[PDB]
Paper text:
Because the S. mansoni genome does not codify an adenosine phosphorylase, one alternative to fulfilling this activity is 5´-deoxy-5´-methylthioadenosine phosphorylase (E.C. 2.4.2.28) (MTAP). This enzyme catalyzes the reversible phosphorolysis of 5´-deoxy-5´-methylthioadenosine (MTA) to free adenine and 5´-deoxy-5´-methythioribose-1-phosphate (MTR1P). The observed overall fold of SmMTAP is similar to that of members from NP-1 family of low-molecular weight purine nucleoside phosphorylases (PNP), which consist of a central β-sheet distorted barrel surrounded by α-helices, as observed in other MTAPs from human and bacteria. Furthermore, a comparison of the KM levels reveals that S. mansoni MTAP can use adenosine with the same efficiency as MTA, which is one fundamental difference between S. mansoni and its host and reveals a potential target for schistosomiasis drug development.
A complex between the SmMTAP mutant S12T and MTA was also obtained; in this case, MTA bound all subunits, causing gate loop closure in the A and B subunits, whereas subunit C was in open conformation. For MTA in the S12T structure, only one H-bond is formed in RBS (MTA O2'—M206 N). The presence of the methylthio group in position 5 causes a displacement of the side chain of Q289 to accommodate the bulky group. The main and side chains of T12 forms the same H-bonds with sulphate molecules observed in human MTAP.
Numbering used by the authors:
A (entry chain A): 3 to 235, 240 to 292
B (entry chain C): 3 to 235, 241 to 291
C (entry chain B): 3 to 291
Amino acid sequence: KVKVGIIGGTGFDDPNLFKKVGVRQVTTPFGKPSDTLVEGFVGDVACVVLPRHGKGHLIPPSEVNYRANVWALKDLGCTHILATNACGSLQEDLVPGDFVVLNQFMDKTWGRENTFYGSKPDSLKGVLHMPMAEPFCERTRQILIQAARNKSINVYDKKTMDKSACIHPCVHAEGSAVTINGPRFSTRCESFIHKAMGLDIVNMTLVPEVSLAREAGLSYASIAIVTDFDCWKHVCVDMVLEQFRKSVVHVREILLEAVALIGAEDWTKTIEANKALVMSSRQDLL
Amino acid sequence: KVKVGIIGGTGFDDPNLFKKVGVRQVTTPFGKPSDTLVEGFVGDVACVVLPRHGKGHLIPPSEVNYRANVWALKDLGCTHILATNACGSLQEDLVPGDFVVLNQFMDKTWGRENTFYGSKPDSLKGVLHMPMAEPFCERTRQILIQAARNKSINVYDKKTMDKSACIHPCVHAEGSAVTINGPRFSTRCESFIHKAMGLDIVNMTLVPEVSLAREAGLSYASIAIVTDFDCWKVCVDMVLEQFRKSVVHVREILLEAVALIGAEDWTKTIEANKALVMSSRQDL
Amino acid sequence: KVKVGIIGGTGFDDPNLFKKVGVRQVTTPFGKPSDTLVEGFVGDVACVVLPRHGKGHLIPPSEVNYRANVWALKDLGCTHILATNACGSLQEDLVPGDFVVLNQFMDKTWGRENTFYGSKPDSLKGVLHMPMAEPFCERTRQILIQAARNKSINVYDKKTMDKSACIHPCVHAEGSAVTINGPRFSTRCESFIHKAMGLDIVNMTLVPEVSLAREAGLSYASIAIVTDFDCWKSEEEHVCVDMVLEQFRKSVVHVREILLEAVALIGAEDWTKTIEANKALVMSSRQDL
Ligand SMILES: CSC[C@H]1O[C@@H](n2cnc3c(N)ncnc32)[C@H](O)[C@@H]1O
Ligand SMILES: CSC[C@H]1O[C@@H](n2cnc3c(N)ncnc32)[C@H](O)[C@@H]1O
Ligand SMILES: CSC[C@H]1O[C@@H](n2cnc3c(N)ncnc32)[C@H](O)[C@@H]1O
């Protein structure tokens, strides 16, 4: 049976997705998650919410315990994780107030625990080399886009639609993220180099969250909230929080509809393949 | 009033900038600085100098306590930091013996403490997300450039001048650095990749020093010394003589830059520096 | 005079290279190596082999003690290190089953000890800034290439041969590697970005091994084994552990043949000046002295 975990980032401290049924404080083999987990239901579908940066946003991106957050949701029997991520746009048609259902990323983070497996005592025994060519669960990506359509939110696909058909605010049907380590924002030089590489948005939290989700055998998809233009075009904290304020109502609608849409389908084969993928990536056993 | 801290890179392990008035062996919340801080004056202007690599150049770039160095200067009441940074050139017009007053960078460092704030036990409490689009203090950059002019050094600005102004040796009035972790120098493949990205010089020490200075509310500017062509493109005695001549020039730039800083009002700039820190605290 | 160390990667967790003469259980000032080191002879040349990931391949690329592996081989008197490195191809002409005698790299690793020297108690006292423009030992590179020829394996030299002269499987006489930190494989986005930078292969273990060998005054060369296309070529078999191990199975005998012949070729030459130069480069790179 399906159970959807939700990891909320900047601006999503009041998800208001369901009346809470229960509240749970857990530990994992990798430490404590960012905060208490809040439990409830969307229809018949069990749902669990946690704030990535903890209540009060005291934890910076580089210090978030991504391993504990993902493993805590796995241990509650989540089959899916939906994530929100505030980001800066590197592209003219990705405008503050738009959303992006990411399908690609380039990793520029460092110093974070990015795998559950290793040779040290605070990791699980083994060597896990996971395929990441298409790093998200494509089924769950498409459910996020379909949820946007079902809630009458514009969807823009730059492959099949002229730029003049891009009506803001819109959900972009694809996009690539560069994940930088933070906590500072990029220089103009860095922003132009990321733009020249063809990346669409920049953010501090996607990785290693997406990677650990796949290690945990979970279907993961992110909805990126464009809160600013990165400085190739000026981003600051107050600018980001103000835009997320204007966009959070849509984030809620999409996530709410997405959970219901997940629950309406059979995931048996996908889940079995998620699990089999973890086992076939163990080099120490092969 | 103003007080200018100076962080001396390679070639400045024992700077003879001013008569030593006092010395300060301090400890910061983030550990010990690279060495004792030397206090004095340039005319009327208070000044503090420390060698980034310590006496004897025993501390490699990745192990320099950038947080302690910057915070120690802040605790002494510095309003500005001037820094020197030896570098390799990535471009044909940047020649050994030239200098660069950097205005941009691309960060390839890792494993260094690059922020004063966090939830970790060895940081101050808070989440600080600093804007860094133009990461230096532009007033202080122009002062280093003017100091070079005042000491009869050629200044070349490829935005406002044609190539005829690029007469060596010259101070390049803008430039972008890639900061690598070291300690090894780049491969030819790495050098060509950085060149293709349009970067001007490569160095090991600019970041996180520039980042932490802005976190500390301080105006910061770097004068980079071109010591070599990086290996995209040489007896040691000639290299050392040329570096020696470059150090004389940089010493003159720094002393003149301190006097230039002391001659202007910085009230509003300093208030803006501090306000940028406060408005960058997301946890508040 | 000469003694050749060998660091075996994937496919070499049990090297099986020569008759075991001595088994060394050692420690270094930087900790324990990945496994015991096996000493013996290839023909008349002394040789030492160790598995980079240890016997069970329980040590991931990010956690290998590169410093201890290299220093341990130095302490046993090695003058040379030959390394194998499994990799994915970023280029149409580098096909699974080919090998690459690397001559360049771009480093995207982090969090690994990459130098013997520093100011902390677990390093040697000093500051070493090594030049790395051409980061391999060129004589030892050419010996790997000659060893392929002596064993009737195709050699492809893009500088002197046309694209239609590339016959697979072949040893490529040059190539650039991007070293990523792992353990995950690259995304499609990352793979196309590395390809656009002109890199030839992607791998997780070359760096800092190559850098520390030069710091130790040793001649180092890597033979990269193309086990997959990296995921830019989606119309091919997508990279995974199982595919890598399967291709390595089909290639390992030829890798051993090149290694064993290269060891013999190294012993057949004089290295007095090259070793003196390796050592002098270390001393002239000390910036505390
Ligand atoms: C509160 S502003 C910083 C937070 O917003 C995100 N963010 C928004 N815009 C950007 C940007 N232009 N670059 C990087 N991260 C950004 C980051 O992931 C971070 O957690
Ligand atoms: C004492 S030599 C090492 C110093 O040289 C500087 N440097 C000079 N040239 C280069 C270069 N081409 N690449 C990197 N760093 C360099 C680095 O910042 C380092 O502190
Ligand atoms: C078992 S597959 C992963 C191992 O082989 C190497 N390898 C093979 N293919 C790749 C690839 N496409 N990218 C990165 N490393 C690879 C890595 O260095 C690692 O030790």
